[model samples]
Target: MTDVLLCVGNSMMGDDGAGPLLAEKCAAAPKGNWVVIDGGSAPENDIVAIRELRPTRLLIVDATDMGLNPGEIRIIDPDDIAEMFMMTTHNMPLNYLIDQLKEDIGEVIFLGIQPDIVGFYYPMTQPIKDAVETVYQRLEGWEGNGGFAQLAVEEE
Candidate 1:
C-alpha cells in the first residue's frame, strides 16, 4: 500500500522542468510513506517500474497548459485527461498510460502546474518555481493552508 509520486518533464525546456525539480527536492528530503521518482521527459519509459511497484496511490505531477495563469496549480481529473490537452512532451500519450495503469493502481491523481515559459536552454520562471516550492511544502505536510483547498479543472 505504498504511495508513489511520478514526476514527468524535461528540465532543459524552461518551465517544463517543474516536475523533475520537484521530484529532486522530494528525493533529497523525503517525507511520509511516499516514493518519489523523477520520470523525466519520457514517463512512458517508467511504465514497467510503476507496474512493478503497484502503488496504492499514484500522483503524476507535470507542467500543463490549461490556459490558466502561470504557476496556477490544479488537480486534473483522470477522466478529463484526454480532452484537457495537457502539455506532455513525451512520445506516448499520457491518457493511454493512465488508462492502462488504472487496472493495477488503486488511485491515480494528476497534479499540474501552469507554466509561464517552455523552451530549450532556459531556466524555470519565477512563478513556476514558487508554485513548485508551494507544492513541495504541501506534500511535506509543512503548509496545510488553503492553497489547495479546491481542485481547479477547466470547464469543458
Candidate 2:
C-alpha cells in the first residue's frame, strides 16, 4: 500500500510555508511507498492524489495557529487536527474529508509547526528552519524503519 505524507500550506506566507517546505525535504529523503506532497493552500488538491494512491499511512505537515511558540512542533492524530483546523481557514474541514475517505485509508498523522507569521513574501524564521531540518532528519530515519514510534507517541 502507498504511504503518503502530505504537507499543506502557503509557502509565500512566511512560517505558513513550513508545510510545503517539509514536503520538499521529505521528498528528497530516501523512501519507499512514501510520497511527499506539497498541498499548498488548497488541500483539496490532495483529494485525487490520496484517492488514487490509497495510502496505508497519511502524514500531514502544516503550520497551526494554536498559540504556541514559533517552530514548536506538535504531533497529533488527524481526527483531532481536523476538529481544530475546521474552525479556521484551511482548504476544507480535515475531518469531513477523512470521513469521506473512511476505510479507503489507514493510519493518519498530523505534524503541526507553530508559525510566527503568515503574511505575503515572508521567509521562514531561523527557528522554523532549524525545526524543519530536525523534523526532516527524524523522518528520514523513520523512512528507514528506525524506531519512529516514539516520535508519534504524543497527541494534540
Candidate 3:
C-alpha cells in the first residue's frame, strides 16, 4: 500500500472525534493506495492490520493541543506527542504506538488538528470539521505527494 492513515480519537468526545469523523468521510470514497483506518481511541488495537498492510508510510491523525486555532493542522514529531496530546482520550501514548510500528511501516507521519473543545458527547466545532476536510482533500488530491510542505511542519 502507498500509505495508511491511522486515525485516532473518540467520536463521542467533542472535537476529539476528529479521527473517527475523518475516517468516515474518507472511507466513503477511495483514494488510490491511501487507505484510511479508524484506529479509534486506542490505535494500538490496529497494530496487526497495520503490520499486514506494510505501507510505505503510516500517517496518524488525532486531535492534539498545539495551542493554535481550532481548525489549524500541522505535522508532528513523535517525540513531541507526549506534550501535544491532552489527557482526554486514547488508551496508549501514540509515540509508543509509532515506535512499535515504525520499523515495519518504513516511514511514519503524525498529524494533529487543534481542538477547540474536548468533553463527553460534545459536538465538534466547525473549524475542526473544516480541518478534517483539509486533510481529506489533501490526501484525495495527493497534493502533498512526496513532501507535505504546504502544511506547517513545526508545532507552535
- Point to the candidate with the largest lDDT: 3
User: How well is each residue in 1-156 modelled by candidate 2, as lDDT tens digits?
Assistant: 677777777878888788778777776664444677777778877778788987787777777655566787777555566555643465355655556455677776667666776788998888887877777777745653333222232445
Off by over 4 Å in 2: 31-33, 86-93, 143-156
Candidate ranking under lDDT, highest first, comes to: 3, 1, 2
Instruction: Compute the lDDT for candidate 2.
Output: 0.68
Question: Taking the tens digit of each residue's C-alpha lDDT, what string does model 3 give over 1-156?
Answer: 468889898998888898898899888875645788998887878988888877788888888877676888877767767555633354245688888888877788888888888888898889999988888778766533424432333435
Please list all clashing residue pairs in model 1, or write none if there are none. Answer: none
Model 1, 1-156: lDDT tens per residue?
A: 687888888888999898899888888888555688777787887888888888887888888777789999877756766656444443244677688788889888877788888889989999999998888878856322215533445443
lDDT of each: 0.76, 0.68, 0.77
Regarding TM-score, does 2 or 3 come out ahead?
3
Alpha carbon lDDT at 54, candidate 3: 79
lDDT of 3 at 152: 38
Candidate 2 positional error at 155, Å: 11
Clash totals for all candidate models: 0, 0, 0
Off by over 4 Å in 1: 86-93, 142-156
Best by TM-score: 1
* Candidate 3: worst-modelled 10 consecutive residues by lDDT: 144-153
